[PDB]
Amino acid sequence: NCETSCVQQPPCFPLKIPPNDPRIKNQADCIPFFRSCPACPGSNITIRNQINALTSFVDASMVYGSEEPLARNLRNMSNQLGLLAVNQRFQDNGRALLPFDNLHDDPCLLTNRSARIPCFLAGDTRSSEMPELTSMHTLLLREHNRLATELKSLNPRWDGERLYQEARKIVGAMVQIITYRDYLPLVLGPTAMRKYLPTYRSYNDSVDPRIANVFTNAFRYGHTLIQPFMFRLDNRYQPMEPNPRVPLSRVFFASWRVVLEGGIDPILRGLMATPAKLNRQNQIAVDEIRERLFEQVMRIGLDLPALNMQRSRDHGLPGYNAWRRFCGLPQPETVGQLGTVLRNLKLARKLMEQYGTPNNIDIWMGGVSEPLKRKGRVGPLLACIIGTQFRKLRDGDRFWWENEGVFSMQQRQALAQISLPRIICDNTGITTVSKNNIFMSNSYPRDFVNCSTLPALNLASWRE
Amino acid sequence: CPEQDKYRTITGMCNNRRSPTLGASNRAFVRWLPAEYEDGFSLPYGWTPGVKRNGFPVALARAVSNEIVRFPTDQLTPDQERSLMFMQWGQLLDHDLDFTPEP
Ligand code: HEC
Ligand SMILES: *[C@@H]1O[C@H](CO[C@@H]2O[C@@H](C)[C@@H](O)[C@@H](O)[C@@H]2O)[C@@H](O)[C@H](O)[C@H]1NC(C)=O
Ligand SMILES: Nc1cc([C@H](Cc2ccccc2)c2ccccc2)c2nn[nH]c2n1
Ligand SMILES: *[C@@H]1O[C@H](CO)[C@@H](O)[C@H](O)[C@H]1NC(C)=O
Ligand SMILES: *[C@@H]1O[C@H](CO)[C@@H](O)[C@H](O)[C@H]1NC(C)=O
Numbered sequence: 305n306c307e308t309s310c311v312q313q314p315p316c317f318p319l320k321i322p323p324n325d326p327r328i329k330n331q332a333d334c335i336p337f338f339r340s341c342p343a344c345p346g347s348n349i350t351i352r353n354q355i356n357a358l359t360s361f362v363d364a365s366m367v368y369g370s371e372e373p374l375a376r377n378l379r380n381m382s383n384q385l386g387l388l389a390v391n392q393r394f395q396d397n398g399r400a401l402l403p404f405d406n407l408h409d410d411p412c413l414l415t416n417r418s419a420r421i422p423c424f425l426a427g428d429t430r431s432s433e434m435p436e437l438t439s440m441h442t443l444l445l446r447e448h449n450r451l452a453t454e455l456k457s458l459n460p461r462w463d464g465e466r467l468y469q470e471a472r473k474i475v476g477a478m479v480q481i482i483t484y485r486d487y488l489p490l491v492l493g494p495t496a497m498r499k500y501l502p503t504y505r506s507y508n509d510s511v512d513p514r515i516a517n518v519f520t521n522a523f524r525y526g527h528t529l530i531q532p533f534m535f536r537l538d539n540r541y542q543p544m545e546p547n548p549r550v551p552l553s554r555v556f557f558a559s560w561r562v563v564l565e566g567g568i569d570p571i572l573r574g575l576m577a578t579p580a581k582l583n584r585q586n587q588i589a590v591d592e593i594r595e596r597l598f599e600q601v602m603r604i605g606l607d608l609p610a611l612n613m614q615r616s617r618d619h620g621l622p623g624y625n626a627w628r629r630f631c632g633l634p635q636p637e638t639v640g641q642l643g644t645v646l647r648n649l650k651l652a653r654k655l656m657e658q659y660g661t662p663n664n665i666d667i668w669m670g671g672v673s674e675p676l677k678r679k680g681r682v683g684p685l686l687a688c689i690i691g692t693q694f695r696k697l698r699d700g701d702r703f704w705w706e707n708e709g710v711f712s713m714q715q716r717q718a719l720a721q722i723s724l725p726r727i728i729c730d731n732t733g734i735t736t737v738s739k740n741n742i743f744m745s746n747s748y749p750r751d752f753v754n755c756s757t758l759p760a761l762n763l764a765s766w767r768e
Numbered sequence: 769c770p771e772q773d774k775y776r777t778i779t780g781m782c783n784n785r786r787s788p789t790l791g792a793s794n795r796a797f798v799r800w801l802p803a804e805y806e807d808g809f810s811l812p813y814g815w816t817p818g819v820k821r822n823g824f825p826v827a828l829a830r831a832v833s834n835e836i837v838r839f840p841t842d843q844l845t846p847d848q849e850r851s852l853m854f855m856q857w858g859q860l861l862d863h864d865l866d867f868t869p870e871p
């Protein structure tokens with residue numbers, strides 16, 4: 305019983321409490337932790353490895369599902385319109401909300417006892433983890449139904465299966481385009497983008513597209529970008545009174561806020577017109593996730609950065625220097641050498657005080673401590689792990705949107721004009737959205753434009 | 769794998785015709801380096817009291833977090849060149865790529 309016990313017995317690997325902890329004064333207590341499911345349980349032959357429950361491809365599986373029974377339950381099958389099922393109890397100003405899930409122990413009901421709003425049901429189980437994530441899932445649900453509705457009027461003989469698949473294929477390509485054209489360049493910076501993601505040529509069936517074990521921990525760099533509040537803005541992009549800056553430890557699993565506190569529009573406005581938190585070597589991750597993660601739905605607040613480190617040990621991941629060696633980067637052995645790699649002798653001294661050797665620094669810890677590459681938000685090690693992963697997902701994907709045969713030349717040219725600000729225009733009541741690049745633009749009104757200036761996806765090439 | 773297909777499967781099966789589970793759901797992660805466990809095959813570093821990792825004591829993950837990650841919330845530095853949508857797309861994208869189940 306990991307949730308409540310401090311005893312180290314499989315499958316529990318609880319995080320112990322150091323002396324003089326700033327929050328947890330009881331040293332007989334602990335931070336709960338379940339070891340990830342082994343791929344080969346009970347074995348004394350195989351070296352323990354972990355499982356990926358999702359498709360590695362950028363195929364909008366967080367929208368459509370990664371298992372066939374769930375994917376059927378996500379669709380509206382009462383007609384031939386190829387739609388995704390929508391919430392039958394509530395609407396967001398006339399617009400669709402995700403269906404509710406039927407969870408035995410629902411954590412969303414714990415966030416507001418009197419509201420009685422359960423978790424949402426989407427392609428991925430974590431959709432209600434924060435209302436900002438729910439907003440993104442809800443936006444893509446509306447985009448699928450909008451696409452299946454336009455395709456039905458354009459091609460009336462197409463049946464529900466054709467309509468679902470054709471709208472699914474477009475949403476998947478949209479997720480690939482936003483990710484590779486707009487998102488990844490801003491993560492890696494220009495030089496690592498050129499190095500790890502050179503111009504796409506064609507599909508290569510010898511490229512292994514699986515997620516590497518280390519990537520599940522290295523991609524947690526995103527924790528350093530998390531702001532301590534959920535920001536909501538009104539029609540004029542001003543704070544939505546009287547709760548415009550709700551602390552993050554009061555939004556985790558708070559599906560009731562989407563349903564009862566103005567829908568997804570105030571949230572999507574806040575994501576667009578509020579800056580991200582910058583990762584600094586002395587300002588790595590906020591206490592809303594470091595001290596109060598899931599506080600309302602659990603016996604104790606969790607430490608997300610500490611869980612990331614315990615998870616890398618649980619996953620048997622090698623240390624900082626082995627990953628530096630894997631990446632073809634120098635491996636510092638003394639405090640002075642680590643100081644030069646990090647351009648920070650003070651941080652290197654503290655890392656040495658904890659670990660003794662740079663060989664033992666946990667991959668997330670070492671990765672997020674590196675100075676940021678120019679025009680990117682990760683350093684040399686993380687850019688290598690992340691770039692290598694994303695190149696394998698693109699080159700090793702037979703259904704990659706630019707692969708010959710996937711879309712027609714005319715369809716590829718129409719898809720090239722998509723953008724996240726335009727998807728917000730089409731599926732929300734928001735009339736003023738960020739200018740491209742949406743991931744850079746963060747100040748209203750300077751970085752904003754009207755819906756009327758951004759052209760919509762032209763589905764003419766999809767006519768049979 | 770059917771010889772001709774127009775759309776992806778839901779599970780990712782049949783994307784790679786020569787190795788049809790590659791990228792498919794509910795499969796073990798690939799490893800880029802061999803795993804490092806206390807006993808070589810199963811126990812994580814930090815499991816057994818007194819067992820050092822490569823010559824040094826294993827540090828408590830919570831102690832690393834307290835001494836390196838911790839910072840005063842009011843001293844947060846906003847990113848002048850990134851929106852909060854940059855963070856949010858990352859989590860949404862992560863949820864398209866991997867989910868590691870626990871018991
Ligand atoms: C851009 C990257 C990124 C962002 C942003 C992000 N995460 Fe993470 N997070 C990950 C990845 C990757 C994992 C590992 C997922 C897996 O494979 O199970 C993860 C894992 C987690 C876990 C599991 C911790 C464990 O025990 O190992 C929690 C909890 C979590 N994230 C919470 C959050 C919260 C809360 C948010 C914000 C609302 C968030 N994450 C935003 C990438 C991110
Ligand atoms: C197809 O890809 C094969 C695998 O290559 C490796 O992975 C890709 C993603 C790159 O990072 C590459 O540098 C790696 O070597 C190669 O064996 C094969 O030669 C490639 N073929 C063509 C024609 O590109
Ligand atoms: N691999 C994960 C797991 C979760 C939680 C479970 C959890 C893990 C550790 C500590 C506490 C609770 C989850 C939330 C909602 C549904 C399923 C799972 C995540 N929430 N955001 N990102 C996440 N990544
Ligand atoms: C299915 O579609 C019809 C037509 O739009 C709608 O009235 C119905 O509520 C939908 N059902 C679900 C479960 O979304
Ligand atoms: C819970 O939601 C209700 C709205 O139905 C609101 O009145 C109440 O104040 C909320 N409770 C808390 C503690 O936020």
Ligand SMILES: [Ca+2]
Nearest residue numbers: 359361365864
């Ligand atoms: Ca996927």
Ligand SMILES: [Cl-]
Nearest residue numbers: 391392393404
């Ligand atoms: Cl319902």
Ligand SMILES: [Cl-]
Nearest residue numbers: 517518799800
């Ligand atoms: Cl690995």
